[PDB]
Amino acid sequence: MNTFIIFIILIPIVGFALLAVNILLAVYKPYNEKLGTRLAFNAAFILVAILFLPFDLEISTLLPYVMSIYLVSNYGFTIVLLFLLILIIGFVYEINTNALKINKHNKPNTDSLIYK
């Protein structure tokens, strides 16, 4: 009965109304010419969304700390410092390995012109 839930139920009423208005209102009239295996992908594509999740789980692990920041003063501060640095080391692993690059397969072919 608050003004919070009329919103939750009323935004769909907005949408249901408008796509009704078009489906009820516009021409359908389709045909064949109007209508209409698998590819390979590089490793960094799947890598960005797989390694996305362990950083996201860290960001919501900071979320209990920054609400409790006064109560654990000088002590939970250092525990969080150690937590953050332990994960910064895995991040410097990740950017030292050049993991998230897609790198181009053709060079200028650097190898020189020798003879005989």
Binding site: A40, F45, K104, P108
Partner: protein, 231 residues
């Protein structure tokens, strides 16, 4: 076997009527194949059944953003065959209208390149300078886009009465209208990163491919015709 995925840059950033079959491995282009002929009309067969004066508009039809240069190359070929010499004023006037044609061409292509990369204000500023120049075309010839002005004997007709005082008034302000377009692209770091090691051609295979003009002079070779073999 790295199997390649095939798409086209079909006709519908392709600048229109181009088809471009690319074969990809993820992100990379391992093979390219431009298909061409969707604009081909047989102008070269049609020139053979027209006289030279009637064959003159076939040339500003092709490369339709740089018209006076296309007229000029055919008129210079027929001049060389005819063994005649154009008067002095007729030379200077075709130097001048071959250079505002050069301004119009570089304007259109630099701003069209900036649009398909993603900068869209230079498109419109350059097209306003193109309106300022297409009026000079309509004063000089009759029509704005296709002018049959440069003819194999010379020039179609004389300038209108007060145009020389007008191209000056245009140039005085175009000098700064160009620096303005230069500022949001030349040292834009996004425009830089998008084109720094893209499209590199070595100077030795720029000759083997038969490349010329801004692509041959992009590679370090000092060659252009209006200095080397002047006319």
């Amino acid at each position: 076997r790295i199997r390649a995925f095939t798409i086209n840059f079909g006709p519908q950033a392709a600048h229109g009527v181009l088809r471009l079959i690319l074969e990809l491995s993820g992100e990379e282009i391992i093979r390219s194949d431009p298909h061409v002929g969707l604009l081909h009309r047989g102008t070269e067969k049609l020139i053979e059944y027209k006289t030279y004066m009637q064959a003159l508009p076939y040339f500003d039809r092709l490369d339709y953003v740089s018209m006076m240069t296309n007229e000029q190359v055919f008129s210079l070929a027929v001049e060389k065959l005819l063994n005649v010499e154009v008067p002095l004023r007729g030379k200077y006037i075709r130097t001048m209208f071959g250079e505002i044609t050069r301004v119009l061409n570089h304007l259109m292509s630099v701003c069209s390149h900036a649009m398909d990369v993603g900068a869209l204000t230079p498109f419109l500023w350059g097209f306003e300078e193109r309106e300022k120049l297409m009026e000079f075309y309509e004063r000089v010839s009759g029509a704005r886009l296709h002018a049959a002005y440069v003819r194999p004997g010379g020039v179609s007709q004389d300038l209108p009465a007060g145009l020389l005082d007008d191209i000056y008034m245009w140039a005085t302000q175009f000098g700064d209208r160009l620096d303005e377009i230069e500022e949001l692209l030349t040292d834009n770091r996004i425009w830089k990163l998008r084109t720094v090691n893209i499209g590199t051609v070595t100077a030795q295979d720029a000759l083997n491919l038969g490349l010329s003009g801004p692509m041959l002079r992009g590679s370090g070779i000092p060659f252009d015709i209006r200095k080397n073999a002047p006319y």
